[PDB]
Amino acid sequence: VFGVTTVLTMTTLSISARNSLPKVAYATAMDWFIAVCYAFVFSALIEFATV
Amino acid sequence: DNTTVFTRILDRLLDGYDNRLRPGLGERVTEVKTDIFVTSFGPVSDHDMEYTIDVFFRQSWKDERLKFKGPMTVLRLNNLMASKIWTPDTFFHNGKKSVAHNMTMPNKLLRITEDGTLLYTMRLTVRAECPMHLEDFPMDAHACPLKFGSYAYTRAEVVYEWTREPARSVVVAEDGSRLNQYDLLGQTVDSGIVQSSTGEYVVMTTHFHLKRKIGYFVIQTYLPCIMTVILSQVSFWLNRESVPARTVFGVTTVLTMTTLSISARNSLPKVAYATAMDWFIAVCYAFVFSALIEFATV
Amino acid sequence: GDVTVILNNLLEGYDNKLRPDIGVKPTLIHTDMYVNSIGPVNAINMEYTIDIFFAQTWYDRRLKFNSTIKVLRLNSNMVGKIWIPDTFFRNSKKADAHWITTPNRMLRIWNDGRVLYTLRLTIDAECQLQLHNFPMDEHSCPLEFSSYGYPREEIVYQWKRSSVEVGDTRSWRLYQFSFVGLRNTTEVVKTTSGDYVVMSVYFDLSRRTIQTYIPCTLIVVLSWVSFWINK
Amino acid sequence: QLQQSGAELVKPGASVKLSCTASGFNIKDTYMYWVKQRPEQGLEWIGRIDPANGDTKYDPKFQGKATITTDTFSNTAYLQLSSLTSEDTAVYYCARKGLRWAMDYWGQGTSVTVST
Amino acid sequence: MIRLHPDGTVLYGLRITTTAACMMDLRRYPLDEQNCTLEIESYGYTTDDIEFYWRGDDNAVTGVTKIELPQFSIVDYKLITKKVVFSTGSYPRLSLSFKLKRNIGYFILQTYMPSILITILSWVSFWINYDASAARVALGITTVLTMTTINTHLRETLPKIPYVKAIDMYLMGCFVFVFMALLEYALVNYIFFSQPARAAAIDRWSRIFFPVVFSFFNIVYWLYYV
Amino acid sequence: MIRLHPDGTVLYGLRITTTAACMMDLRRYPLDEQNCTLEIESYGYTTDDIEFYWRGDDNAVTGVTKIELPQFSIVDYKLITKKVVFSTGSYPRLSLSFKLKRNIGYFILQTYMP
Amino acid sequence: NIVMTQSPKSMSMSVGERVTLSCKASEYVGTYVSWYQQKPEQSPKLLIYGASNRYTGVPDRFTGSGSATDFTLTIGSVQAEDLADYHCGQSYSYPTFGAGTKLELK
Ligand SMILES: *[C@@H]1O[C@H](CO)[C@@H](O[C@@H]2O[C@H](CO)[C@@H](O[C@@H]3O[C@H](CO[C@H]4O[C@H](CO[C@H]5O[C@H](CO)[C@@H](O)[C@H](O)[C@@H]5O)[C@@H](O)[C@H](O[C@H]5O[C@H](CO)[C@@H](O)[C@H](O)[C@@H]5O)[C@@H]4O)[C@@H](O)[C@H](O[C@H]4O[C@H](CO)[C@@H](O)[C@H](O)[C@@H]4O[C@H]4O[C@H](CO)[C@@H](O)[C@H](O)[C@@H]4O)[C@@H]3O)[C@H](O)[C@H]2NC(C)=O)[C@H](O)[C@H]1NC(C)=O
Ligand SMILES: *[C@@H]1O[C@H](CO)[C@@H](O[C@@H]2O[C@H](CO)[C@@H](O[C@@H]3O[C@H](CO)[C@@H](O)[C@H](O)[C@@H]3O)[C@H](O)[C@H]2NC(C)=O)[C@H](O)[C@H]1NC(C)=O
Ligand SMILES: *[C@@H]1O[C@H](CO)[C@@H](O[C@@H]2O[C@H](CO)[C@@H](O[C@@H]3O[C@H](CO)[C@@H](O)[C@H](O)[C@@H]3O)[C@H](O)[C@H]2NC(C)=O)[C@H](O)[C@H]1NC(C)=O
Ligand SMILES: CCOC(=O)c1ncn2c1CN(C)C(=O)c1cc(F)ccc1-2
């Protein structure tokens, strides 16, 4: 439940975050921060899955 | 001075020409000839129920006063000349918001033959209105009309006739169908007479036929329904002892049906009655409840 | 041949700015309109679309030609010259006439004055929308027109015998409502300039979310099946 | 309104030329048709000419066997047959389009008989 | 502008802004090539009175080397001269045409990965012992509904075009895969009680046959639509 | 309209639809008071050339009471007369300003109580 | 090619009686049917053009009605001279005529 909560919040955050900004080829200086949030939360999820 | 002869001819031609009077006022009626060359058939809209069409609306009528004796025998006059001579008023009985282009110079060619026969054509962008019947959605085959008739002149003064034989008048271009949902079939033309409070007016008619394509909706909604029903019928082959498994299996099929129906019914335009897809979705949605209640009584 | 002579005689010594009978009793314009279709009606914007064929008639002593020609029709090229009465729609938000091929206007001058002037329109009007009466709700959408620059002492409207028509009621494209009735009233309105005679035609409509709240409550009640399952 | 040539008698294999003269109107306004009628049978369409541009069409069964040319100045339309067999022994008409594409004015018709 | 000359050579230049319409084919979307056009021609004069031709085929069109699109990218532009015949005459035409090619890296990760992940997770269920059947049943159900929800959510952010695409065929393929996997497990669960060796073989054969067929299908797909 | 008079008093009237722009401070949303305005001035004539003044100050603007917005409510309107200085000269100006207030009861139940 | 089936083939009716003919059109023809009268050894004449429209100089008893693909001629009080041949022919496309009907009085 905890992990599903975190995942759903991250996704619903990322949608609007990238919606407020135009669609350019390169990655903005906010895509990196979102991707680091994302990588940490899914690393925690994989850790839970293997434990 | 090679243009002076033509300028003198033209100035003598317009000497005392009264544009308010149609040709042959007290004599025989004026007989306008019409012809359409649809360049591209625009995007039909279900919500607003309007369809955009592009035309090269051609006209031709015999005016007696413009006859001349000259060397060229066909005057290809400019676009400004078209306003001074008589030009028949031809509106569209069911066109909401049309537009005549003015891109780089008004798009109107005016040809005067030696006999007196004129030619007059525009490049309109018509936006008509066609009522639809969605009772067979999404398998409907409905026909959108287009009615254009003379205005301010009764039938005793102006009569429209198709330029060529009616089968070969309304022509659609080969690759002009910039249309995605539907598929074009053909054309149908039919003269007529429409009586009103003012008088009897002549009214040409054109019917364009349309048939919706189903290939998208097959892989969109129907096939997920069939898959979900087949999946919900799988429960019977599960073991009767594993109760929670069968319960979850039955509930999730209803969940899938709800998601699928919500996703599908959104694109449907608003109507008062029930469309033909609604019955299929309702039955596809009731069979899973049947299977669930069956599991319950078991 | 002679019609050009008649027109040139009518237009000589004719002044466009002045309405007929400026010093004596006011002109009496008769009005008659024909509703073609009623556009989509929405409750949010509180407005609706209509498409009518406005037609109005008035005597005029200066157009009194005498000849054998009883009636002369005219194209729209003549409207600019002779007098034409200003008439705006007080309820209009955005009104535009139609010029698909040419200006859509008609002009008919009978033997003794009595000009006829008709023209197509397309109007967007504010309809006072109320919803508490539901299921017995009966919305009334007004359309009221009146002169702009002339007081009651200088112009007066009046309807004809029937003066309102409808056609093809099945194809009016309106879904949530349904056409029921139609009435007509005349009033007098006082404003900054003076007193204006305000015609008014307003016809009634009746109504025939709930399909979307069910999938939410269904999933809510259905999630509870978890509880009675063994731990 | 319309006149045609007198009765024609010709041997098979030859070619005969028929004429339809229009008096009272310039043909360059309307079209011109040609219709044949066998004894005790229904009418049958042959061709169609436009004197304004010279365009012509033909019944696919008569294509190549009939030729329609017009003289705008003398105000007449001519129908010249090809090598004709002994079969087509019938009356020929010339018509002018009416209001709703109904051929209203008809000629008296000429009789072409193929004999030896 | 108007710029006369001593020998009568006028030069007339406007400054216009056209919202042209070009047929776009999205069957191969996302990775597709679009050829958009702009046809210039006369209207009142036939080919007997006027003639059109580009004034220097090399430098007839400039500034294309500098245009920047947010998504597409210019590849090549050509110049054509034709003669079009309508029902009234033969009109002169000139044409401007330049292909468009989309960027690749942004959309692929956004769209394709979730379905591949769902298919791999549906594969994860095979290793589980047949004793704890409820777990694999729950997995085979959750994968189906998660895939359906992913499809429904993806069908909104994409541009609404009512004809068949390639990404839709791909998603339907993945849906068929997970559905076949769940039917396979249902069969195994029903037939096991009569004969254990049948299921003990089918598990080890399916574990190696699903990924092979999946990779073969993807190889065919990415060979034909790239 | 054009209305002449025996003493030469012309009267010129129009019927205008203006999509004017007013600045809205939303630091206090949704419990805020808005001051949206409409500013009018001459353009080619300096203050040595033309003079603006409201006619019938009490009755300069009419029909405000009948106005009813779906979300706001017209509390009060005031009238102003000024002289503005630009780089080219001194131009006259008139102003119309009326406060706007929100209906808090429509937002209380929908936002705060959860 | 459009084909025009006319029925009946031949019918006889007494004087002053009601007579009705039919001209079924296989393909589509949008109200361009035209009825021609041919007395023996003369030239055809135009009775009805379009549908329910009488060409000038035609008596009042000749009346017709039309539809999309079904067409009907309705004579009123038949007279002595009205005995002739009647042909229905569509001009929606390259025109073609019907077989023809002969009406002899009895
Ligand atoms: C601020 O600036 C803007 C732009 O700079 C101003 O807008 C312009 O306002 C003027 C003043 O009225 C207009 O001139 C007049 O427009 C009317 C009606 O216009 C209609 O048609 C327009 C196109 O005009 C025609 O010509 C083209 C050529 O191809 C044809 O395709 C058309 O079919 C037309 O025939 C069209 O653009 C207009 O649409 C717009 O305007 C309406 C109304 O505002 C809007 O609702 C729309 O949404 C849209 O924005 C409109 O449809 C014409 O009728 C006038 O021409 C006649 O009248 C003159 C004076 O009476 C006369 O001198 C002319 O010769 C002509 O008269 C002829 O016809 C008479 C019968 O009607 C005869 O009796 C007579 O003998 C003669 O033969 C005139 O053109 C501009 O069109 C308009 N331009 C634009 C782009 O909107 C704005 O007004 C300015 N604001 C202020 C406060 O001043
Ligand atoms: C984009 O689409 C346009 C048309 O929609 C393409 O234009 C076509 O280009 C070809 C060139 O490959 C033309 O062929 C030419 O044929 C003439 C015949 O004499 C000859 O000069 C050459 O052999 C030449 O190849 C063709 O006429 C032209 N127009 C068409 C097909 O209608 C265009 O090539 C497409 N691609 C690009 C990058 O523009
Ligand atoms: C919306 O904001 C404007 C901007 O301030 C308000 O206008 C202001 O109104 C007050 C009084 O209504 C003006 O005060 C006046 O100052 C002159 C200066 O000589 C004085 O003579 C008057 O007796 C009065 O005190 C003030 O100048 C004016 N501000 C501007 C910039 O014009 C407006 O009132 C606000 N809206 C509402 C509804 O209050
Ligand atoms: C009731 C007054 O009606 C008009 O003022 C009117 N003005 C123009 N027309 C009408 C009649 N009318 C309802 C039409 O639809 C119509 C149809 C035509 F083909 C030609 C003109 C008109």
Distance B106 CA to ligand 1 centre (A): 15
Q: Hey, where are the domains in chain B? A: 1-213, 214-298
Tokens matching residue D8 = 């024609």
E25, burial (CB in 10 Å: exposed 0-12, middle 13-18, buried 19+): exposed
Is residue E218 within a helix (H) or strand (E), and if so which, with residue range? Answer: helix E196-224
* Cα–Cα distance for residue pair B12/B75, rounded to 1 Å: 14
Provide, as residue numbers in chain F, all residues whose Cβ is less than 8 Å from the Cβ of C193: 1, 3, 11, 13
Is residue C202 within a helix (H) or strand (E), and if so which, with residue range? Answer: strand C195-207
* Pick from B5, B157, B46, E219: nearest CA to C75: B157
Residues in CB range of B286: below 8 A, 6 or more apart: none
**Residue F12 assigned ligand-binding role:** no
* Cα–Cα distance for residue pair E92/E84, rounded to 1 Å: 6
Confirm if B41 and B175 have CB atoms less than 8 A apart: no
Q: B79 in contact with G at a CB cutoff of 8 Å?
A: no
Q: C198 in contact with B at a CB cutoff of 8 Å?
A: no
Q: What is the DSSP string of chain F?
A: -EE--TT---EE--------------TTTTS-EEEEEEEEE-SSS-TTT-----SSGGGSS---TT---SSEEEEEEEEEEEEEE-SS-EEEEEEEEEEEEE-THHHIIIII--
Which ligand sits closest to the CA of F22? 3
Q: What is the CATH number of domain C1-208?
A: 2.70.170.10
Q: What is the DSSP string of A1-51?
A: -HHHHHHHHHHHHHHHHHHHS---SSPPTTHHHHHHHHHHHHHHHHHHHH-
* Pick from E160, E166, E174, E169: nearest CA to E226: E166
Q: What is the 8-class DSSP label of residue E158? A: S
Tokens matching residue G85 = 């041949």
The residue assigned the tokens 């680091």 is: A36
Beta strand D110-114 with D8-10 is: parallel
Angle, to 10 degrees, between the axis of helix B243-265 and the axis of helix C214-223?
170
A24 to E103: CB separation less than 8 angstroms, yes or no: no
Our mutation pick for probing the ligand 4 site, out of C53, C74, C101, counting the most ligand atoms within 8 A of Cβ, is C53
* Cα–Cα distance for residue pair E179/E184, rounded to 1 Å: 9
Ligand 2 contact, E149 CB (< 6 A):
no
Provide, as residue numbers in chain C, all residues whose Cβ is less than 8 Å from the Cβ of F2: 149
Ligand 2 contact, E80 CB (< 6 A):
yes
Is residue G85 within a helix (H) or strand (E), and if so which, with residue range? Answer: strand G85-90
Experimental resolution (Å): 3.9
* Cα–Cα distance for residue pair E168/E161, rounded to 1 Å: 12
Provide the residue type at C145 as one letter: F
* Cα–Cα distance for residue pair F17/B113, rounded to 1 Å: 50
* Pick from D25, D18, D26, D36: nearest CA to D77: D18
Reported residue count of chain G is 106
The number of beta carbons lying within 10 Å of the beta carbon of residue C35 is: 20
Alpha carbon separation from G13 to G17, G19, G24 (Å, rounded):
7, 7, 22
**Residue E88 assigned ligand-binding role:** yes
Report the gap between the CA of E135 and the closest CA in chain B (Å).
9
> What three-state secondary structure class fits D63?
coil
The residue assigned the tokens 């909560």 is: A5
Residues in CB range of A3: below 8 A, 6 or more apart: A41, A44, A45, A48
Is residue E76 within a helix (H) or strand (E), and if so which, with residue range? Answer: strand E72-85
Residues 114-153 of E with CB under 8 A from B: 133-134, 137-138, 141-142, 144-145, 148-149, 152
Residue A32 phi, psi dihedral angles, 5° rounding = -65, -45
Q: What is the 8-class DSSP label of residue E125? A: G
Distance E95 CA to ligand 2 centre (A): 10
What's chain A's Rg over C-alpha atoms? 13
* Cα–Cα distance for residue pair G19/G83, rounded to 1 Å: 12
* Pick from F101, F99, F30, F98: nearest CA to F72: F101
Interface test with C, best of F2, F3, F16 (most C CBs within 10 A): F3
Provide, as residue numbers in chain G, all residues whose Cβ is less than 8 Å from the Cβ of D35: 97
* Pick from G6, G4, G5, G32: nearest CA to G102: G6
Residue E181 phi, psi dihedral angles, 5° rounding = -60, -45
* Method for structure elucidation: cryo-EM
The residue assigned the tokens 């203006």 is: F18
| Sign of the Cα pseudo-torsion (C88, C94, C99, C104, in order) | negative
Order of strands, edge to edge, in the sheet holding B58-60? B74-77, B108-113, B118-122, B58-60, B30-35, B158-162
**Does chain G reach chain B with at least 3 CB pairs under 8 Å?**
yes
Q: What angle do CA B131, B134, B137 make, to 5 degrees?
A: 145
For chain C, the straight-line distance linking the first and the last C-alpha, in angstroms and rounded, comes to 104
Provide, as residue numbers in chain B, all residues whose Cβ is less than 8 Å from the Cβ of E175: 224, 227
Q: B159 in contact with D at a CB cutoff of 8 Å?
A: yes
Angle, to 10 degrees, between the axis of helix E113-124 and the axis of helix E196-224?
170
* Cα–Cα distance for residue pair D14/D56, rounded to 1 Å: 23
Q: Which atom of ligand 3 is nearest to the CA of F98?
A: 38
Residues in CB range of G8: below 8 A, 6 or more apart: G21, G22, G101
Q: G43 in contact with D at a CB cutoff of 8 Å?
A: yes
* Cα–Cα distance for residue pair F17/G32, rounded to 1 Å: 53
Query: Which residues does chain C break after (C to N > 2.5 Å)?
Result: 208
Q: Per CATH, which fold does B1-213 belong to?
A: Acetylcholine Binding Protein; Chain: A, (2.70.170)
* Pick from F34, F21, F23: nearest CA to F69: F34
Beta strand spans in chain D (E): 2-4, 8-10, 17-22, 32-37, 43-49, 56-58, 66-71, 76-81, 90-97, 103-106, 110-114
Q: Which atom of ligand 2 is nearest to the CA of E99?
A: 38
Q: Which atom of ligand 1 is nearest to the CA of C96?
A: 46
Beta strand spans in B177-223 (E): 182-189, 193-195, 200-212
> What three-state secondary structure class fits B255?
helix
Ligand 2 contact, E37 CB (< 6 A):
yes
Pick G49's closest partner by Cβ from D60, D102, D108.
D102
Report the gap between the CA of B169 and the closest CA in chain E (Å).
11
> How far is Cα of residue B131 from the mean position of the Cα atoms in its chain?
11
> What is the residue range of G25's domain?
1-106
* Cα–Cα distance for residue pair G34/F1, rounded to 1 Å: 59
The domain tally of chain G equals 1
> What is the residue range of D92's domain?
1-116
